[PDB]
């Protein structure tokens, strides 16, 4: 009944990563001032380019330039010696106001929570019991050494690094009655951009000692765990230098890893009437609190809309065997204790609140007690 | 035991389409002149602007200006009152070539059946006996209502549709040993740029008679089957003056509607180099073979890579209980029939040859039996 699976993460100064970020700062940039903004925001980093793309409608009065420069700061991208400086890359802005046909045929002159999804589409929730937050260990893993490389890089640790990285993690599980259940690492990739001084050597050992064994606990690694540690053997070109860089390129980074599965819309760059983000919130939202509430092991949720209309089109639960009820059973729970409306979630989930750009790196989901992370008492 | 699944499509006018469409039409015109190129060639879409953004080292001579503006030329944007034109648009390159620290780690002084994986990553391929082509029916209807649209376009049957056209299909199936059989459709989605002209009742009473029908056979269709038909009310603005577009934003719609997984990988504007491409037409190829060759009625496979290693780190099977055979024995299988080293897929695949434009709209697989959708013959 063994398994390998595997996820991966990128840091935040991989430039797929950096794009998702800078559509957030934009949105929170214009949510701070107009709650109510309509954003869609589309990044791409290339060479010493940011380019914001898109259309916003919003009574904010934002400075681009000020805001895309203070996300790649803190990004740490500093100094042409690491590829990329905020202070001196070019911003060009290419944003137009939102569709007057869009807008019409969603929410002008509609009451708030009876708005029209602002696109069509489909959507998923995902939830496992296998970890306490209710995500798959792999990307669990995988996001928390892109988070320890930027810590041992920013607290001068390891002042080598830089910015861009990607990692990824296999896990060997066993099958428990359509549950599954870690039993150790199998292999574990790092690559992570640095400077032109230090050698290979002292990179594989400082990943293996520092970053490695300060993430994954010992009693999931053994002496057949495979280690992929700088496996280029090279890597100081990186950033948007390395490669372009575009908002929504990492969307199972930014959600289950490949488990469960995903509608196709990207997240930053987006306010609440754009059900890409927010139907896929409030759909972790169901399968975290059907997990939390003991109905299930693991599930999945699928919602779907159309352009225009505020109500669902289709709910769908799958649990992989893993609850006494049927399927149908869960799917009433779900009916009698959620109301998927855009403008019902946008109360629910709080979601004309700034805080996207925090969101924009290490995955939307299983950190931070996000309202969307916090389980809803279910009555049935 | 019925429960309802959505996947939807979209047509080759809309803008992250346009960009994939783009993007293939660069790749092939390299390898036309040189099949070794390494491609990695993103497209953003906006109003006016097609730009170019990525990384190309190759041999070929290609003018850029002209492959861009033909592939617009072909998908109809040829006149500014279609908000787009491919004679007058600003077509911006950005295009460098591949960093040498990527090409001395994958391809440099290799052999090529050992290139390295041009990225590390992860991807699945999936396949369901409920249609012949091995696809879900809620995916290959979205697709055939956006070709129909298109087709009617071209011949002059509904002289009053543009390019960017969505639609969506949720149907209502029944579990049958964790195989899924379609018993009807319940929900229909289009939408689809316009003309000024054209009004609501002539345009719905069109999309049902002359698209629904003409594409949906009639036993899915009954009395309860629910249409949005042009929900928004007006879409005369379309295509990239609508609404951003970018390369590797529609991985879903390219791939299984929803069902199945995805690595989060684009394929679009890449060479065989990047796994994400051809080790996903490779696991395709794998699940159908499996799913043809009478071992289970639906599979997903999972495999991943680390950049500048040849050999997959993991492979895994999951039939969701539609075979006789465990998981391990399906695995073995597949371990004994299949070499997915890029290196080998390149020769299986034929992935050198310029027919990728040819995959960028409509989805890259289920249909036109390209090497991925011919089954291998297993032994065992
Ligand atoms: C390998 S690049 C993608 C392929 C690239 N566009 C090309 O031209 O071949 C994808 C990501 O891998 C990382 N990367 C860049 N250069 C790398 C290197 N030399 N070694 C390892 N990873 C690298 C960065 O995070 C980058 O965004
Ligand atoms: C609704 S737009 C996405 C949201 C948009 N960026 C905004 O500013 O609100 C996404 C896709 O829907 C389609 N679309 C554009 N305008 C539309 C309209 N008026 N009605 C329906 N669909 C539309 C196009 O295919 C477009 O690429
Ligand atoms: C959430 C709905 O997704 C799925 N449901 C099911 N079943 C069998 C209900 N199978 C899948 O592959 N996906
Ligand atoms: C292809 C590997 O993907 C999966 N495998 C499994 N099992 C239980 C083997 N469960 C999943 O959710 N996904």
Redesign the interface.
């Known amino acids: 009944?063994?398994?390998?699976?595997?996820?991966?993460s990128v840091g935040e100064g991989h430039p797929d990563k950096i794009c998702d970020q800078i559509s957030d700062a934009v949105l929170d940039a214009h949510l701070q001032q107009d709650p109510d903004a309509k954003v869609?925001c589309?990044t791409?980093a290339?060479?010493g380019?940011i380019?914001l793309?898109?259309?916003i409608t919003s009574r904010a009065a934002v400075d681009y330039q000020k805001v895309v420069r203070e996300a790649v700061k803190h990004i740490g991208y500093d100094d042409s010696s690491k590829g990329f400086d905020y202070k001196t890359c070019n911003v060009l802005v290419?944003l137009?106001q939102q569709?007057?046909?869009?807008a019409?045929?969603?929410h002008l002159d509609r009451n708030e929570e009876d708005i029209?999804a602002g696109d069509?589409?489909?959507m998923?929730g995902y939830a496992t019991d296998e970890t306490e937050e209710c995500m798959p260990l792999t990307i669990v893993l995988a996001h928390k050494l892109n988070a320890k490389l930027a810590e041992l890089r920013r607290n001068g640790t390891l002042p080598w690094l830089r910015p861009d990285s990607?990692t990824?993690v296999?896990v060997q599980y066993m099958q428990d009655r359509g549950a599954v259940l870690p039993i150790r690492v199998?292999?574990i990739?790092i690559?992570v951009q640095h400077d032109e001084e230090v050698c290979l050597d002292e990179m594989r050992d400082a990943l293996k000692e520092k970053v490695i064994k300060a993430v994954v606990p010992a009693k999931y690694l053994d002496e057949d765990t495979?280690y992929?540690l700088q496996?280029?053997?090279?890597?100081?070109?990186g950033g948007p230098?390395?490669?372009?860089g575009?908002?929504?390129?990492?969307?199972?980074?930014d959600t289950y890893?490949?488990?469960?599965?995903?509608?196709?819309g990207?997240f930053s760059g987006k306010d609440y009437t754009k059900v890409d983000r927010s139907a896929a919130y409030a759909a972790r939202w169901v399968a975290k609190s059907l997990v939390k509430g003991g109905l299930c092991r693991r599930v999945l949720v699928?919602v779907?809309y159309?352009?225009?209309?505020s109500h669902p089109?289709?709910?769908?639960?799958?649990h992989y065997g893993t609850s006494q009820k049927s399927?149908?059973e869960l799917?009433e729970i779900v009916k009698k204790n959620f109301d998927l409306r855009p403008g019902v979630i946008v109360r629910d989930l709080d979601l004309k609140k700034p805080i996207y750009q925090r969101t924009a790196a290490y995955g939307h989901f299983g950190r931070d007690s996000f309202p969307w992370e916090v389980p809803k008492k279910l009555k049935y």
């Open positions: 009944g063994t398994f390998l699976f595997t996820s991966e869609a589309e791409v290339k060479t380019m380019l793309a898109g259309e290419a137009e569709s007057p046909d869009i019409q045929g969603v029209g069509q589409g489909l998923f990607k990824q296999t199998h292999t990739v690559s495979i992929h496996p280029s053997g090279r890597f100081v070109i230098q390395g490669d372009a575009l908002t929504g390129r990492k969307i199972i980074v890893g490949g488990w469960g599965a995903h509608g196709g990207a699928q779907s159309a352009i225009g209309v089109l289709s709910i769908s639960i799958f399927e149908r799917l």
